[PDB]
Amino acid sequence: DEAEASKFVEEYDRTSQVVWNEYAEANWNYNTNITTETSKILLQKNMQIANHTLKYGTQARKFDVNQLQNTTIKRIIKKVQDLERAALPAQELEEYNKILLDMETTYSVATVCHPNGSCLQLEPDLTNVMATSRKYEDLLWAWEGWRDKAGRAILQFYPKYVELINQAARLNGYVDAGDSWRSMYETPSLEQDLERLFQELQPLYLNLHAYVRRALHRHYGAQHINLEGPIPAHLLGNMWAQTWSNIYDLVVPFPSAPSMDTTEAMLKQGWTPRRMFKEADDFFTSLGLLPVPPEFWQKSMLEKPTDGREVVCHASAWDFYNGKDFRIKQCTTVNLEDLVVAHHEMGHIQYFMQYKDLPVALREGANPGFHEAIGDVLALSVSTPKHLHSLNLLSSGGSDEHDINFLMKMALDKIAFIPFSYLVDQWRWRVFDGSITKENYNQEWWSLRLKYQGLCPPVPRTQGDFDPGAKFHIPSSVPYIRYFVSFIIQFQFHEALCQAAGHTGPLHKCDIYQSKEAGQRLATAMKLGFSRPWPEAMQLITGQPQMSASAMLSYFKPLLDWLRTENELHGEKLGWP
C-alpha cells in the first residue's frame, strides 16, 4: 500500500503539471481570442486532459484511502478519485464540453442593439449605462436588453447542462452537482453555518435597503418606488444590483462634505490598466509578499484588445501549473471599481505563487472562499480615504461626516452584496437537486431575488426569460457561494491583520500598507494550499478557527447606528413582503 501510494502521487503530480499546463494554454488562447480555430483546439485539449484524468482517476480508485498512514498522501489520492466531468462517457463528455463552450461564448459576444445604430457590449458599454444613467427608461432599456440578449440565449443550453453536470457528479459519488460543489469546503454544517452568517448581517442590510429605497423614492418619484415594498432591480447602478456603490451620489449621507471624482482623478493623472496593477503589485510587496514575475507583464491581457479580437472580458487570474507562468485576463477600465477588482485578481496571483511548490493536487485555496478574499483584504486598505489620498486620488479626512460617508460608500459595495452572493447558489443548489425544474427557473430566481435582496423586476418576466443566464457565473458554470464566504472572512482577516499591524481605533480606519507582520500571516496561510482543512488557515490568520460575521459587523458598526437613527426618524418600515 504505502510504498505504492507515495509513487502514484509522484507520477500523478509530474504528469498533471505537463498536461494541465497545455490545457491552460489552449484555454487561454480561446478566452483571449474567441474564434472557431481556438475553440476546436480547446475542445481538442479537453479530451486530452480528460484522458489524463481517467487514467489516474481510475488508478487512484484502486487504493483504500482510509487505510494509508500518511495524511498528505491520503488527501491527494482521495481528491484524484474525483474525475469530475471526466467521469462522463466519451459521448456525454464531448456534448458537455461543447455546451460549456457554447454557453460561455454566447455570453461573451452578446450585444444589445438600439435605435441609434449602436449595439452595446457588457463591458464597458452596458456597464457604464447602469452605473451612470439616472433615467428610468434608459436603465430599463439596458437592464431588459441585456437579459433579452444574454439571458434568453442561454436557456436552450441550460437544462442539458444541468443533466450532464449532475450525471458527472453522481458518477463521482455525489448526489448531484450542488452536493459536489458544496463538498469543496469539507464542512458538513456548511448550509447552516452560512444561513447563520446570513441572518447575522440582516439588520445591517435591512437598514441599508430601507435608507437607499428612500433615496431612490426622492430621485425617481413616489410613483415608481414603494417605501414598503421591494426596489426595482435596475436602479442600483450595477447590471445585477449586486453592489450599489455606483449610486453613491443619490444616497450621500452628508452631501455637505464634497466628493472627489476619483475616476476623473485617475484619468486626469493619466492612470492606465497597467498603472493600476503595478499599484496592486506594490501593495503586495509592501507587505513583504511576492511580486508578479516579469513574465506576468509580458503575457497578461490587462485591457480589452483593439485588434478586432473577440474575448471573454470578465476578470480572472490564471495558473499555468509550471510555477512561473501566472496571468490575469481583464478588460480593465480606468476607475476605482476596477482598481479594486485588479487587487482582487492580484490576490489570486499571489496565492498561486505562494503555494506553487506543493503537489498540483493541493494547489488550491484553503477553500474557495480564501482564494477569493486575499485581494479583497488589501483592497480594503486601498479604499480608505487616507490611502486613496496618498495615491493623490482624494484630497483628504477627519470629520465624522466624512467618516459616515466613507462607511456608506463601502456598505453599498460590501453589505449590498451579501444577500446576492447568498442567493445565486441557493438557486443553483435547488436546480441541481431537482426542486426547481426548467419550468420554474426564472420564477424561483425572482422569488429568491425578492426574499433575500428585497428586489423586484422593473419589467414583468415572461416565458423564455432566463435571467440567471444574464449573470456570468451561470453559463460559465463557476460556483458562486465562494464570494459570500469571501465577503464574510475578508473582514475577519482585515481585523486580524490590523491587530497584528498594531492598528488601534475603529477598524474601518485601518490601512495595513507596508505591514510586514500582516504579510507574514497571510503568506503562512496561503502556503498551506489545500494541504489542510481550512479551519487551520483561518486559525493561522485570525487566531481562531471559524467564519464569523463579528468582524464585518464591527467594521460597519458606526454606520449601523447612523442608519437606525436615520431610518427611525423617517419612520421607515424595514424589509418588504
Ligand X SMILES: *[C@@H]1O[C@H](CO)[C@@H](O)[C@H](O)[C@H]1NC(C)=O
Catalytic residues: 345, 473
Taking CB under 5 A as the criterion, the residue among 323, 479, 535, 558 binding Cl ion is 479
Contacts of 159 (CB under 8 A, 6+ apart): 438
Which of the choices ligand NXA, ligand X, Zn ion, none does residue 341 contact, using the CB cut-off of 5 to 8 A by kind?
ligand NXA
Which of the choices Zn ion, Cl ion, ligand NXA, none does residue 467 contact, using the CB cut-off of 5 to 8 A by kind?
Cl ion
CA distance 236 to 230: 12
Question: What letter would DSSP give residue 399?
Answer: -
Q: Where do we find the cell 459519488? A: 173
Residues that bind ligand NXA (CB under 6 A): 315, 341, 344, 483
Please report, as residue ranges, which positions from 29 to 48 form the binding site for ligand X (by CB under 6 A).
33, 35, 37-38
Taking CB under 6 A as the criterion, the residue among 48, 67, 71, 199 binding ligand X is 71
- Applying CB under 6 A, what is the total number of residues that bind ligand X? 10
- 482 in a known ligand binding site: yes
Q: What is the 3-state secondary structure (H, E, C) of 296-352?
A: HHHHCECCCCCCCCCCCCCCEEEECCCCCCEEEECCCCCCHHHHHHHHHHHHHHHHH
Which of the choices Zn ion, Cl ion, ligand X, none does residue 137 contact, using the CB cut-off of 5 to 8 A by kind?
none
Q: Which is nearer to ligand X, 76 or 560 (CB)?
A: 76
CB neighbour burial string for 322-345, b if at least 16 within 10 angstroms, e if fewer: ebebbbbbbbbbbbbbbbbbbbbb
Please report, as residue ranges, which positions from 121 to 150 form the binding site for Zn ion (by CB under 5 A).
none
Which of the choices ligand X, Zn ion, Cl ion, none does residue 482 contact, using the CB cut-off of 5 to 8 A by kind?
Cl ion
CA nearest to 448, candidates 463, 434, 428:
428
Q: Which is nearer to ligand X, 14 or 224 (CB)?
A: 14
- Are 493 and 540 in contact by the 8 Å Cβ rule? The answer is no
Give min distance, CB of 317 to ligand NXA, in A: 9
Q: Which is nearer to ligand X, 64 or 137 (CB)?
A: 64
Please report, as residue ranges, which positions from 21 to 80 form the binding site for Zn ion (by CB under 5 A).
none
CA distance 465 to 473: 17
Cα 458 to its chain centre, rounded Å, is 25
Please report, as a single letter, which amino acid is at residue 57: G
Which of the choices ligand NXA, Cl ion, ligand X, none does residue 344 contact, using the CB cut-off of 5 to 8 A by kind?
ligand NXA
Q: Cis omega before residue 124 (within 30°)?
A: yes
Window of 65-73, 232-240, 245-253, 448-456 that interacts with ligand X by CB under 6 A: 65-73
Contact pattern from residue 365 through residue 404 relative to Cl ion, giving x for each residue in contact according to CB under 5 A and a dash for the rest: ---x------------------------------------
Which of the choices Zn ion, ligand X, Cl ion, none does residue 479 contact, using the CB cut-off of 5 to 8 A by kind?
Cl ion
Output the CA–CA distances (angstroms, integers) from residue 378 to 29, 288, 364, in the order listed: 30, 13, 20
Taking CB under 6 A as the criterion, the residue among 55, 268, 309, 516 binding ligand X is 309
Please report, as residue ranges, which positions from 164 to 223 form the binding site for Cl ion (by CB under 5 A).
none
Window of 28-36, 170-178, 436-444, 463-471 that interacts with Cl ion by CB under 5 A: 463-471
Give min distance, CB of 372 to Zn ion, in A: 5
Window of 70-78, 143-151, 196-204, 466-474 that interacts with ligand X by CB under 6 A: 70-78
Please report, as residue ranges, which positions from 317 to 376 form the binding site for Zn ion (by CB under 5 A).
372
Q: Where do we find the cell 441541481? A: 432
Q: How many residues does the chain have?
A: 577
DSSP, residue by residue, 210-256:
HHHHHHHHHHH-TTT--TTS-EEGGGSSSTTSS--GGGHHHH-S-TT
Contacts of 94 (CB under 8 A, 6+ apart): 43, 46, 47
Please report, as residue ranges, which positions from 389 to 448 form the binding site for ligand X (by CB under 6 A).
none
Which of the choices Cl ion, ligand X, ligand NXA, none does residue 483 contact, using the CB cut-off of 5 to 8 A by kind?
ligand NXA
- 75 in a known ligand binding site: no
Give min distance, CB of 1 to ligand X, in A: 13
Question: What letter would DSSP give residue 393?
Answer: S
Q: Which is nearer to Cl ion, 45 or 147 (CB)?
A: 147
**CB under 8 Å, gap of 24 or more: what pairs does 392-398 form?**
392/265, 392/269, 393/260, 393/262, 393/265, 393/266, 393/269, 393/336, 394/260, 394/262, 394/265, 395/260
Which of the choices ligand NXA, ligand X, Cl ion, none does residue 73 contact, using the CB cut-off of 5 to 8 A by kind?
ligand X
Residue 243 touches ligand X, criterion: CB under 6 A: no
Q: Which three cell numbers stand for residue 44?
A: 481538442
CA distance 443 to 462: 9
- 185 in a known ligand binding site: yes
Q: Which is nearer to ligand X, 257 or 362 (CB)?
A: 362
Max distance between CA atoms of the chain, in angstroms, equals: 74
The footprint of ligand X (CB under 6 A) covers 33, 35, 37-38, 70-73, 307, 309
Binding residues for chloride: 147, 185, 445, 449, 482
The footprint of Cl ion (CB under 5 A) covers 368, 467, 479, 481-482
The footprint of Zn ion (CB under 5 A) covers 372
